[PDB]
Amino acid sequence: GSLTEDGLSYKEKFVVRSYEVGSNKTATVETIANLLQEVGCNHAQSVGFSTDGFATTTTMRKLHLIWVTARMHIEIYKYPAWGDVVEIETWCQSEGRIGTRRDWILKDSVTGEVTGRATSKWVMMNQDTRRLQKVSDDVRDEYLVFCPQEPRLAFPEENNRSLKKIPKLEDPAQYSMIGLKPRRADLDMNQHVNNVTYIGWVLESIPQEIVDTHELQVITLDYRRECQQDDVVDSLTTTTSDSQFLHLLRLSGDGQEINRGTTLWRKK
Template identity: 30%
Template sequence: MESKVIKNYFDKQFELRYFEMDKFGIASPSTILILLEETAADHCYSINHSLYQLEKQNIGWVLISGFLQMERYPHYKEKIIIRTWLSEYSAIKGFRENIIYDEQGNIIGRAKALWVFFDIERRRPVQILDDIKEKWSFCNRESINYNISKKIESIDNSDFKLKFKVNRYDTDMNKHVNNLRYLQWVTESIPDEIVDNYYLHSIDGRFIAEAHYGQTVASLTKKNKESNTFMHSVKVEGTDKVCATAKTIWKKKETRTHNKM
């Protein structure tokens, strides 16, 4: 995997591995989210403010909202480049932009996220270090014109529901349930006929409150009036506490062959 800084951008190349594939030899949505997070982490490392260095100061980055849109998912052994940059800062928040390119330079995905600089022990936002802003700089270009600050309403009545216990491996270094886990909980509650015949074209998510180790969460999914569109809520079972809300849009899969080992 190669990384490089180009002006205000940061590029990281990945080669898709076997265990990151679904049964069709195509990368899963979870894989893409992992690679986006790895790119962001490496961008931190590149300016000598790695997540582990920040943790020693009891600070880190927490995802508040995010949007991912994929035109297609890469296949086994395909090389992709994720380009990331910061498009806007406030005192405590930053908007991270991402574009995903295939080997031919075609754009196959876009993502943007709102991150808050966070005091891990006190559980509250803090001001972003000036050195981070200076070294990262910013570019006011957007990867996609999409409002990720707009509220997504929670659902109470669902068409599909699954429950999950929060285990140790679900949490990250900030003592949060990892963002990846919410995506997995949401997609697990999608009916099989959708997952088998459609792909996740986009997901728009909001992270509202923490779920803790040992708790049980319920993933609620409701069909939207738009075709192949679903609304989601993740709640702590037995309470009114909403941890996350989301909207997903699914598109029909194209018939394609996949690489074999």
């Protein structure tokens, strides 16, 4: 991979692996999300930021501050097949003291056709207290020189799917998968549950008949609280409709919300 000519974005190509595909012999949405995280990490490394998923500066590390994902939104038009080469371009853009956006565009390397796009909202938090704090005009200045200054959006329209408010699923759920728990492979280098694991947990409560007859076109997922390595999660889903679903992940015992989301599926 490499920074582009203007140095304000990063591109990398990936060959889809045998263990990365689902029953259609094409990449799963979790494989796509792992590749989005990989190119985001390589972009941080290319310019000197931390490579632990938090993309921090030396000053943020002295203050115990990190960037954390509040929302992930992914839209896929065509999943790449096993052995196909997919090229992913990514960039960041500040959205004021509230937070920052990282966007991605996925392309078929042979045709140059756009096969998917994604956007994510990040907030700054103290890693120990978990309290959010607005971005200072000294931390912000460190990042501005690596971002485009004119708006560059993977989802340009005023109020498109990526910005829609997500309601809270009400009991009883139509479908559920309970007692889900992370194993060591689900953790990152810091022993935290990887953001992609929550996507897998959301999808566990979609009926197998939908997965067999449909393809996932859009997934929007809010992150409210972490699942600790010793927590247990319940995944709940209700049809709201193409087929559309509302999703909720909550801790198995007291029912504390950890994530909410929606998915849209197209018939094959």
